[PDB]
Write a protein that binds this ligand. Structure first.
Ligand SMILES: O=C(O)c1ccc(-c2nn(C(=O)c3c(Cl)cccc3C(F)(F)F)c3ccc(Cl)cc23)c(OCC2CCCCC2)c1
Ligand SMILES: O=C(O)c1ccc(-c2nn(C(=O)c3c(Cl)cccc3C(F)(F)F)c3ccc(Cl)cc23)c(OCC2CCCCC2)c1
Lengths: 260, 269
């Protein structure tokens, strides 16, 4: 609750975030804007560029891309879980509430952090080694094309806030420590942690974006749109599963989606 | 370098050690010796009453957990160990020079060090008759732990065997604060990128521990050497520990936790 303490918490979370997520927004942005020789991605914009891309960096292409999304989402769940344990107080919570917070929080976080990998033309893949175009993703057949596009729609709006990794590290923590998740046993300790995270985010945004009016409020308003987009994602994903048999969901994602 | 620098480092680490860990050795020993009473778990019925009266957070039934007591206690060890890792990680940041290391090397040092540190610090909570749990609110007997069925009983006992020998050195919290730092700053962990600064810090921690032990146990002959020799018992039992855990997972079908819980505890299983 004191500034030094709030700045210390910000530094802690940023450092843990760097340790936990291999591909930061800062690195993604350097790749997307370029001007460098060594970091240029191979761009996948059609079927044949995809073929060449596998040789550089079976199933029907839409499915293969879906399985690529879910395999990375599972890895992201693992990275997010490691990050969560570094949030002060999280591992001391009731073990059931830890599961619950991760269960309902990972999806919102994956959307947030996916945006870091995206611009209006596509998304970085394979640790930034590839770039798959939005138009290619959107043109995937039957339900898959429309499954991909809303991730871009959110990302373009979220990215206009110009958050950097130091901002995102605290924002992600706030999302995880949401006391309103269904089935929480002890709301008060989660809310006490979140108030400290919210206080730290508030000061971080004031110091890092002093010219950005009410960025704190605008970012909390983004957490609202995240709740709606994750809801649409699950409903669409359920429909796809009840139509496509060639789709396995990783048992970790399978568990997260059950009862959700 | 100089005596004052080494004493300052000792005091800095001691002060941080107190801040980082919930139950110090000094407080634990007062409880173990009877100097009010912790709730005592000595059999199945006292365990049931103890979880119902006291809230032993690591041995409370989860959803999708084994109801078998031996498994529940085993997993409780793993859940507390997860908590200890974060405590050790926070302590590490207070060691002068540590946060300036390469971030990958900070991660590596903590990764390969926490097991040795958890064993070491567990000894502070243990005597030959049992172990303090829940910040000293409970005391679980060695006989109860050792009498758990199949491999679980034999998984518990080696921890007591080590602790009893380690505790004969009669280290206090000011000694342990430096010793634990020395363990973290081990230059021989696999995959370190820049060993030189890690050994430079460890050499300072070693000088500080050597002087600490001379001043705090002037009558304890070659205590510095005997404590470094305990790295032999520590490296060996962590090795044994890994083999034991493997047998349990490749044998026990009733160990299922919610996959998100499995992910949280993934480095300790
Ligand atoms: O690296 C990451 O951090 C990363 C993170 C996320 C995705 C991703 N997840 N995702 C989902 O639907 C999804 C979500 Cl958001 C949350 C949870 C579960 C899922 C799902 F299980 F259902 F999969 C996308 C849809 C559209 C798009 Cl463009 C991306 C995703 C991701 O994409 C990897 C590559 C996409 C292009 C082809 C090659 C692989 C990468
Ligand atoms: O408070 C602490 O600082 C504390 C510290 C350690 C333990 C502990 N760790 N441990 C391990 O096996 C272990 C080790 Cl040493 C190193 C690394 C990882 C593990 C493991 F992940 F595999 F778990 C025990 C075995 C036997 C016994 Cl008696 C204890 C431990 C500890 O136990 C708490 C339990 C509460 C419920 C009732 C039973 C004791 C508490």
């Amino acid at each position: 609750m004191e500034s030094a303490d709030l700045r210390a918490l910000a530094k802690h979370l940023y450092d843990s975030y760097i340790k936990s997520f291999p591909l930061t927004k800062a690195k993604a942005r350097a790749i997307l804007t370029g001007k460098t020789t060594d970091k240029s991605p191979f761009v996948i914009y059609d079927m044949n560029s995809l073929m060449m891309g596998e040789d550089k960096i079976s199933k029907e292409v839409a499915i293969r891309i879906f399985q690529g999304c879910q395999f990375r989402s599972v890895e992201a769940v693992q990275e997010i879980t490691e990050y969560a344990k570094s949030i002060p107080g999280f591992v001391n919570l009731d073990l059931n509430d830890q599961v619950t917070l991760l269960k309902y929080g990972v999806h919102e976080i994956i959307y947030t952090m996916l945006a870091s990998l995206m611009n209006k033309d596509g998304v970085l893949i394979s640790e930034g080694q590839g770039f798959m175009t939005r138009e290619f993703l959107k043109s995937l057949r039957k339900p898959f094309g429309d499954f991909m596009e809303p991730k871009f729609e959110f990302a373009v709006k979220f990215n206009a806030l110009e958050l950097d990794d130091s901002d995102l590290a605290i924002f992600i923590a706030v999302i995880i420590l949401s006391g309103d998740r269904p089935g929480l046993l002890n709301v008060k300790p989660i809310e006490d942690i979140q108030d400290n995270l919210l206080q730290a985010l508030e000061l971080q945004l004031k110091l890092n974006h002093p010219e950005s009016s009410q960025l704190f409020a605008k970012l909390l308003q983004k957490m609202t749109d995240l709740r709606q987009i994750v809801t649409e994602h699950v409903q669409l994903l359920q429909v796809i599963k009840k139509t496509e048999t060639d789709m396995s969901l990783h048992p970790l994602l399978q568990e997260i989606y059950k009862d959700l």
